[PDB]
């Protein structure tokens, strides 16, 4: 009867005896249908919930005042859906029994199943308010509040639970999840380790420990945590992805490959492993599978951004630009924050040329991710390409400030330094990069050139041999050489190599021009409508104040308009030089192009101009645009008066030279043809701008009786107008080797004016000795060369003729008055150790000898000083002046005795300067056109003995001259005597022969014949 | 006057205005000398503590009631030493001013400077009791209590401090130290990271974080923590050691080398880095520096144990045993817990031979460190050497249970399995090791032999070729071959290889014997005092129940005592065999040696015995001690009646053979000489132990008229005594090829007794058919061969002659009555695929043919079954019986038709069995002595046609016999006819010729001549 062994069968889990005995109870004592609801609890477990409703109906019918029937009613109703009604009678419950426990619990279970979190929380908190011991209900507020987001209020529920039942191993792992959210890992992995020590058959702790151990980049322990995690469940398919990532990061690639296969096997629909597997393959070589795998990944989802980026990159290694373009577009528009896509897109845009939008991509990429040095470097490349921002230099610097492990970035900023004039910084940076990058050739090449600028010849021949190997090797790799085409003529290389580099750069230029597919010009054969007058075109980024201009400036002045019409084309923007003033002054057609960035319309403009002959000044130099010639608009395009070494363009037509400078033997290394001058291709210009030095004057020396022209002299546009003012001075007929013929002229320029001790002359001597600015006697402003720029800079800038009378002194530069002056003025870098041995020998073999140099740049003086005594010379036998502007630059040479040449590559213009000054010059031909230049001027002067054939000959000639002072005197003589009679200055004749040669060229072309070596005009 | 801007100058830190103004105060208001004690505070900072005492004297004199004077007095006194007096007036202080603060603090400073911790603690706690705000005093109780050791009471002082002033960055790092002590690292590295985030110019936190990060075996983060630690202090010399250890553990050896150099540079006296640097070098090759560095280390301290161990190891690679011995002794006695030294010492003891003490070293090494698998493996080697503990097998198992990555350990336990009879386990283990160790040759060799036991011929020729390569390669490495000398004659190898392996093992044996330096014996030339009688010695670990004994047992029975005296030497302990009973029964001198483990006294005993001729039975087999012969005590030592293949000992003297088995052609591969028998060297023994089978009897077959001897037969010691009891049975003269001569004898053994249907004979037939135990008629116990062991095991063990009458039936083993029976009984492993093809061919070419085998072992039946039908045979054409003891083993052969030989290596004894049984035998000579054996018996029988010369001949002979049933009948005839007349059994004659040959040998030796091939005796 009344007995709970039926409830004990419930304790066992059966009903048979319980149900029969409770059936007996109903048939004897129908008051406990609640036991039938316990039977209904069996029914909940055994789905006989219909009979649960039956028993509940009985209970409520007999006993309408027991909540528990409604409780079971709610359970079955939640199974059957009416959850709001379940709440209806649950809240109808808990009224008659306010202290009922399980009602609150499963009520909250109901509401949370309905989405009404807030009510559920109050339900639990009420339950706790009644009972503080439910050590497994607290953890459920944990699971709830932490889901709501009120983290810091959660972490106070777990902790009560833990301290209540300290073996509880589910209130440690959850608490681990909270600390993992707030960001403090070093506690999160602690709490997890406690919660597997307490219960080593628990799976969630093992995973979560794996995850937070592969964020903190511990790896070995992460592997162990996973391995146990799956030996509790061996087919998890999500462990199998992470485990691969860890294997891939340790460096054990093959295990990653295998495990990824296992993961995709276990679960097929899985884009991430596809993408990541693709990366795993791509780094192992089998790229074909990589592309296919990326295809599969975006098949399962066309929006998975990572695959888009990576596949686009893969295509971009095959130049398939637009595919990658649109794909990067897609990824960026899906994910508007993905910095890597920004970088990749911008770089391919750099390939596209358009860059300002690429610039803003670089900007925004940094904006989202402020720690991406690579983008800084690349955007610096962009800026340097589009302008010359030194803030871009700062951008490089920022990259180093983020990571100083970039050899390439250092190389960049060093390039800016070299361009600017910051030589030491560039040196330091290149050494930095090389010490970080042993293998980098380009840094080696630029560093080599910089060292050659600074005369530091440590390991000299070693450097040349290594870099010769590098250029040969690089050229075989079918890439553009590191060595700049201009820099070549410093290093000793084969003719084949120098040519090959020239064509490398030339074909590079035509490679840019080709892709534009601009229509060809049908220009040629226009000599009839031309009405017998030809058209000549010159281009120059150096119309203005530049040595090239200083050399060709007067050529348009006497061009024949009858059969020729001249067209000027200034590439550079104007700078208001008097040079340029003259340029458009006598120009038949002056045309500016600084307003024309378009290669097209410029070339087209040439096409309408229909210029028969087109001539270049620039070639490969700083600041030129040769592609304008690469399109070959005009029928004939030629090199002239530029750096030697043919471009190898194959569309250039005619070099300019003479019979001897470029003989036919070396015609194998010049891509294009030859044109021969009667005397030389290098035309003088000084007499036009400085005819004032046509006559001179010299003061008396400290000693008398002997002649000393080259210590202190007098010059001035009105020096002759000053001679008559002199009361009585000596005028000796200075003689070259004469013998008595042709010296019996008026000899105004052939008689040296030697002023002996004269009262006015002596006086002005003392007022000049003290460094006084200038004095004026007899209406003539008496001046020194040193302060002519202060008197009027324009007089010395060459553009303006000087007016005053000029005096110069050896000791004005501290020069002793009785030392044999050997000198030169070429830029410093064109000197090597070997030639330095040559000056060493000659200077040693003369006691009262001095070598004159320039500190241009000044940073090389210590280094040359070192080797000066290393081969045993004092630090007083060599004297080096500072840089002086053009007029006094050429004037101060007149004080010197004998200049000497640099055999590595001659001074193109400077040798002309000293020759015009009347000082002698001596050289030995090399083997390159540049090297061969120097003898050309002498041959035009017809002084063959001043040319050597071997290095020993050079030394012997220098010794023979330096010893033979008398012959030196008459050498300065005959140089002076020829310079007035030389054909080097008949610019009338030069233009004459030049135009005549053009007409011969054009008449040969009128036959349509191929260009050929037009020897013997 | 009264003004504290003097105290403000103190705030600045100067005294000038303060001291002058307070001097003015004293001269106007002499009441504040305490300001002069503030001046004295400057004095403490500026060592003017004498004037501090002066000012204190003034203050106490005027004001004897201010503690502060005593406070300054205590400070200076602590400087001056009287610290107990400092406490004296400090405790004298704090009386008038009980609430003074700084007194408590510096009081505790005083006491802790005196070693009285306890009082100091109360001092601080009192201070706190007054003021709860001293956020920088709590941390000092921390520093104190944690030093006392009351950790868990410390951690409650820090925590109050931290929450008081949460920026305090010295109460985080210390608290980190506490958690590091209690053992919970994952909190320790947390608290440190908080305490560098709060203060990044703090050094102790950076080190301590480094240390606890290289215990938890994080490495990269440890490197970073150190690198910053020294960029705050760049010459620390203790960081520089740990940093090396971390570099060495990452695998970046060279950085470790460099940093160790840097550490020893910074600080010279530093043994640990020396020792550790030595390890760093030793693993890089430069061992010479390693020894020197260890020398330096123990120079700075002769007690540094680690260096002792490592240096001793280094020496032990140079065999310098005693040096390492004493050194390990030193290290162990310094450090009585160092398990590694225990292991090393024990292993070198294993080299020393003495092992029981090495055993206890292994025990104690495990005892201290219960997780050292290596020692388990080694001690297992020891135990297996000294006894055969299978608990040692368990020791191996324990090693795997610690780490199953030991291929070598698996190989060991597999060796035990193979020795025991646990073949499958050995197979599994060897495969396990090989799959873990691709490179291991020895496992390959043993695994190969095991496979050959189990007939699994997968990849057969591939295995032989690979292992042939391995043995050649191993032999060139000047090491003992993996292949056991006995196992060789299974694999096909060159004569050179087999010889070479024999000498490898032989020289190995003499290598053990050599080191003992036992004095040589002056035995030889003793034939005069011998009085004309020679002495012969036999050794055998197989006197007893063993085939060798079963073969030579009766030889001592007829040895001539006149000129020879025999000496027996049983190596093995007695087992009470009737064999052994006979052995000492007719022995001239039976000598036991199981009581003699000493090689010495045994060899000496032989020396006093002065035995002229010494003969071996064992050779390289299981259970032998050949070194006893390696010492060559007796003048002459010979191989005889053992496994073929000369030992290559070079101290063996004479093999035994005949003219034909071992012709002179192959004498190149036998180290020692030859001795020729008139007929053969292999002597029969059966007639002595089984003369009962001299006569037989056969029952009638199912069919009549034709003769069928080989289906059901009768035997028994009294079968002839039973023949007369028969009323009337047929006695047909069974004929070999006779022709009518010599067959006209009494023919008792030449007439086959064929019992036709006879009432008593038929009756006993039925009472045997049902498997009845046995029946008895006419006083004769009628028995079947199958139950003879149950009747009396002794009768079948060979030792005892059977008594009853024996019957046997073909179907008694299920054999069909009319199938051609081809058979053999050799051990299973002496079969290959190729010969199996041979039986395949012959068995195919006869319809009613059956092949009889044995399942010995039974594990090979499935594998042979596979290949049986693989070459296409049914599973009923081959029948295999179980193992049967000796008597019925040889008896059941009589039912068979024709036995067949295994050409790989013949059955030494079994062929003799079947020959004695009268069944025919056929073979083809191989090329090794073992192979050549089989034809020897036939040649002694003079039946040459039963010998083949090629494999095809073998098949053709088998076909010709199997087809020719009549000739088969007369073949069984002539085998039976010869076996009674054969010289194979005249043991009288065998001993005769044997002794005569000894005497010839000894008479040749009496001349002192070198041993030579004594052909033609």
Distance between CA A346 and CA A361 in Å, rounded? 6
Of B214, B212, B211, B143, residue with least CA distance to B174? B143
CA A283, chain centre distance (Å): 28
Strand A676-677 to strand A657-658: parallel, antiparallel, or no bridges (unpaired)? Answer: parallel
Distance between CA A272 and CA A177 in Å, rounded? 24
Q: How far is B298 from chain A (nearest CA, A)?
A: 37
Q: In what order do the strands lie in the sheet with A613-616?
A: A590-592, A564-570, A534-540, A613-616, A636-639
3-state secondary structure of B430: helix
| Residue B29 contacts residue B56 (beta carbons within 8 Å) | no
B889 is in an annotated binding site: yes
**Tokens standing for A236?**
């998890």
B884 is in an annotated binding site: yes
Q: Chain A interface, mutation test: which of B180, B188, B190, most A Cβ atoms within 10 Å? A: B190
Q: Chain A interface, mutation test: which of B185, B186, B221, B223, most A Cβ atoms within 10 Å? A: B186
**Tokens standing for B657?**
């053979």
The DSSP bridge partners found for residue B782 are: B775, B805
Distance between CA A148 and CA A160 in Å, rounded? 19
DSSP string of B560-618, one letter each residue: -TTTEEEEEEE-SPP---HHHHHHHHS-SSEEE-TT---HHHHHHHHHHHT-SEEEES-
Structure solved via: cryo-EM
Of A186, A217, A220, the CB nearest to B186: A186
DSSP string of A861-899, one letter each residue: HHHHHHHHHHTT--TTSEEEE----HHHHHHGGGG-SEE
| Residue A185 contacts residue A177 (beta carbons within 8 Å) | no
Q: In what order do the strands lie in the sheet with A712-716?
A: A730-732, A752-755, A697-699, A712-716, A805-809, A780-784, A774-777
Q: What share of chain A is helix, strand, coil (3-state, %, to 5)?
A: 55, 10, 35
3-state secondary structure of A480: coil
Of B186, B217, B220, the CB nearest to A189: B186
User: Which uninterrupted H or E stretch holds A313?
Assistant: helix A305-316
Cβ count near B173 (within 10 Å) = 23
B486 is catalytic: yes
Selected catalytic residue, list A486, A495, A546, A589: A486
The DSSP bridge partners found for residue A878 are: A851
Distance between CA A178 and CA A155 in Å, rounded? 7
Q: What share of chain B is helix, strand, coil (3-state, %, to 5)?
A: 55, 10, 35
Q: How far is A248 from chain B (nearest CA, A)?
A: 18
R_g over Cα of chain A: 48
| Residue A778 contacts residue A763 (beta carbons within 8 Å) | no
**Fold of domain B513-686:** Rossmann fold (3.40.50)
Distances from the Cα of A878 to the Cα of A495, A865, B328, B708, B894, angstroms? 36, 9, 76, 133, 125
- Residue contact A186–B184, C-beta within 8 A: no
Distance between CA B653 and CA B671 in Å, rounded? 9
Distance between CA A121 and CA B515 in Å, rounded? 89
Residues of A whose CB is below 8 A from B217: 220
> What are the residue ranges of helices labelled H in A165-286?
173-182, 185-197, 203-215, 220-230, 239-250, 253-266, 271-282
Phi, psi (5° rounding) for residue B744?
A: -90, 50
**Tokens standing for A673?**
């043809």
Q: Chain B interface, mutation test: which of A182, A185, A186, A215, most B Cβ atoms within 10 Å? A: A186
Of A588, A525, A507, residue with least CA distance to A555? A588
Distance between CA B45 and CA B13 in Å, rounded? 10
User: Which uninterrupted H or E stretch holds A638?
Assistant: strand A636-639
- Residue contact B187–A190, C-beta within 8 A: yes
A889 is in an annotated binding site: yes
The DSSP bridge partners found for residue A664 are: none
Q: How far is B8 from chain A (nearest CA, A)?
A: 46
Cβ count near A516 (within 10 Å) = 10
Phi, psi (5° rounding) for residue B590?
A: -90, 130
Q: By a Cβ cutoff of 8 Å, what residues of chain A touch chain B?
A: 184, 186-187, 189-190, 193, 217-218, 220
Q: How far is A258 from chain B (nearest CA, A)?
A: 19
3-state secondary structure of B298: helix
| Residue A628 contacts residue A539 (beta carbons within 8 Å) | yes
Distance between CA A478 and CA A485 in Å, rounded? 16
- Residue contact B190–A193, C-beta within 8 A: no
Resolution in A: 3.8
- Residue contact B186–A184, C-beta within 8 A: no
- Residue contact A187–B187, C-beta within 8 A: yes
Of A450, A454, A468, residue with least CA distance to A411? A450
- Residue contact A190–B193, C-beta within 8 A: no
The DSSP bridge partners found for residue A568 are: A538, A590
Residues of A whose CB is below 8 A from B193: 186
Strand spans (E) along B855-979: 878-881, 898-899
Strand spans (E) along A550-631: 564-570, 590-592, 613-616
Enter the DSSP assignment of B809.
Answer: E
Of A190, A211, A192, residue with least CA distance to B185? A190
Enter the DSSP assignment of A819.
Answer: S
């Amino acid at each position: 009867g009344p007995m709970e062994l039926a409830h004990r069968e419930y304790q066992a889990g059966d009903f048979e005896a319980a149900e029969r005995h409770c059936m007996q109870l109903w048939r004897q004592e129908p008051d406990n249908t609640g036991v039938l609801l316990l039977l209904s609890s069996i029914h909940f477990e055994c789905r006989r919930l219909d009979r649960s409703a039956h028993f509940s109906t009985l209970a409520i019918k007999q006993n309408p005042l027991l909540a528990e029937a409604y409780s079971n009613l709610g359970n079955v109703y939640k199974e059957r859906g009416q959850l709001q009604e379940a709440i209806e009678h649950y809240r109808h419950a808990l009224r008659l029994k306010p202290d009922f426990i399980d009602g609150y619990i499963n009520l909250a279970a109901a509401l949370v199943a309905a989405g009404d979190m807030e009510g559920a929380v109050q339900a639990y908190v009420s339950a706790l308010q009644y009972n503080p011991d439910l050590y497994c209900v607290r953890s459920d507020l944990g699971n709830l509040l932490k889901a709501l987001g009120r983290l810091e209020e959660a972490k106070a529920c777990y902790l009560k639970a833990i301290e209540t039942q300290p073996n509880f191993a589910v209130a440690w792992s959850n608490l681990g999840c909270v600390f993992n959210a707030q960001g403090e890992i070093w506690l999160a992995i602690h709490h997890f380790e406690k919660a597997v020590t307490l219960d080593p058959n628990f799976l969630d702790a093992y995973i979560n420990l794996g995850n937070v151990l592969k964020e903190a980049r511990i790896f070995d322990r992460a592997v162990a945590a996973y391995l146990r995690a799956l030996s509790l469940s061996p087919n998890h398919a999500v462990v199998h992805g992470n485990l691969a990532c860890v294997y891939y990061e340790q460096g054990l690639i093959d295990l990653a490959i295998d495990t990824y296969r296992r993961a995709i096997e276990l679960q097929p629909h899985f884009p991430d492993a596809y993408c990541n597997l693709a990366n795993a393959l791509k780094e192992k070589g089998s790229v074909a599978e990589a592309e296919d795998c990326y295809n599969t990944a975006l098949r399962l989802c066309p929006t998975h951004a990572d695959s888009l980026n990576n596949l686009a990159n893969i295509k971009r290694e095959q130049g398939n630009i637009e595919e990658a373009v649109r794909l990067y577009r897609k990824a960026l528009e899906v994910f508007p924050e993905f910095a890597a896509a920004h970088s990749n897109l911008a770089s391919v845009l750099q390939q596209q040329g358009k860059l300002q939008e690429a610039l803003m991509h670089y900007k925004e990429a940094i904006r989202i991710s402020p720690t991406f040095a690579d983008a800084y470097s690349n955007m610096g490349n962009t800026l340097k390409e589009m302008q010359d921002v030194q803030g871009a230099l700062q951008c490089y610097t920022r990259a180093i400030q983020i990571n100083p492990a970039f050899a390439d970035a250092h190389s960049n900023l060093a390039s800016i330094h070299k361009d600017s004039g910051n030589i030491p910084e560039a040196i330091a940076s290149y050494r930095t990069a090389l010490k970080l990058k042993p293998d980098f050739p380009d840094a080696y090449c630029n560093l080599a050139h910089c060292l050659q600028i600074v005369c530091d010849w440590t390991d000299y021949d070693e450097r040349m041999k290594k870099l010769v190997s590098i250029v040969a090797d690089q050229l075989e790799k079918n890439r553009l050489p590191s060595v700049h085409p201009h820099h070549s003529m410093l290093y000793p290389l084969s003719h084949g190599f120098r040519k090959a580099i020239a064509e490398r750069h030339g074909n590079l230029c035509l490679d840019k021009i080709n892709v534009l597919h601009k229509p060809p010009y049908e220009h040629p054969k226009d000599l009839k409508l031309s009405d017998g007058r030809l058209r000549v075109g010159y281009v120059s980024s150096d119309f203005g104040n530049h040595p090239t201009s200083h050399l060709m400036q007067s050529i348009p002045g006497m061009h024949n308009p009858d059969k020729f019409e001249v067209f000027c084309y200034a590439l550079s923007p104007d700078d208001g030089t008097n040079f340029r003033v003259k340029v458009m002054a006598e120009a038949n057609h002056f045309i500016d192009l600084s307003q024309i960035p378009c290669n097209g319309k410029a070339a087209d403009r040439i096409h309408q101009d229909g210029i028969h002959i087109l001539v270049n000044m620039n070639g490969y130099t700083k600041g030129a645009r040769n592609e304008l010639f690469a399109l070959r608009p005009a029928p004939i395009q030629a090199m002239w008066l530029g750096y030697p070494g043919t471009s190898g363009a194959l569309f250039m037509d005619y070099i300019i030279t003479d019979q001897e400078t470029s003989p036919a033997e070396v015609a194998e290394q010049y891509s294009e043809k030859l044109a021969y001058m009667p005397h030389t291709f290098f035309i003088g210009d000084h007499a036009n701008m400085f005819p004032h030095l046509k006559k001179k004057a010299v003061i008396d020396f400290k000693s008398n009786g002997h002649i000393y022209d080259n210590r202190i002299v007098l010059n001035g546009i009105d020096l002759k107008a000053f001679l008559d003012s002199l009361p009585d001075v000596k005028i000796v007929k200075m003689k070259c080797p004469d013998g008595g013929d042709n010296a019996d002229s008026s000899n105004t320029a052939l008689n040296m004016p030697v002023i002996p001790m004269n009262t006015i002359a002596e006086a002005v001597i003392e007022m000049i000795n003290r460094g006084q600015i200038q004095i004026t006697i007899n209406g003539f402003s008496i001046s020194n060369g040193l302060a002519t720029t202060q008197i009027n800079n324009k007089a010395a800038t060459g553009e303006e003729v000087p007016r005053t009378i000029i005096v110069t002194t050896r000791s004005q530069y501290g020069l002793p008055e009785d030392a044999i002056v050997y000198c030169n003025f070429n830029q410093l870098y064109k000197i090597d150790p070997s030639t330095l041995q040559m000056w060493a020998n000659i200077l040693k073999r003369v006691p009262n000898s001095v070598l004159w140099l320039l500190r241009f740049p000044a940073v090389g003086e210590p280094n040359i000083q070192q080797y000066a005594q290393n081969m045993g010379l004092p630090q007083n036998r060599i004297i080096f002046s500072p840089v002086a502007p053009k007029e006094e630059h050429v004037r101060r040479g007149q004080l010197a005795d004998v200049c000497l040449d640099t055999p590595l590559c001659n001074g193109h213009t400077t040798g002309m300067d000293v020759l015009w000054a009347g000082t002698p010059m001596v050289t030995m031909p090399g083997e390159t056109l540049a090297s061969r230049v120097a003898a050309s001027q002498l041959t035009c002067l017809g002084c063959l003995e001043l040319i050597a054939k071997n290095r020993q000959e050079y030394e012997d000639i220098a010794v023979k001259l330096g010893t033979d002072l008398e012959y030196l005197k008459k050498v300065r003589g005959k140089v002076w005597k020829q310079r007035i009679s030389s054909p080097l200055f008949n610019t009338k004749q030069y233009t004459m022969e030049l135009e005549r040669l053009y007409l011969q060229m054009w008449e040969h072309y009128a036959a349509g014949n191929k260009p050929d070596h037009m020897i013997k005009p």
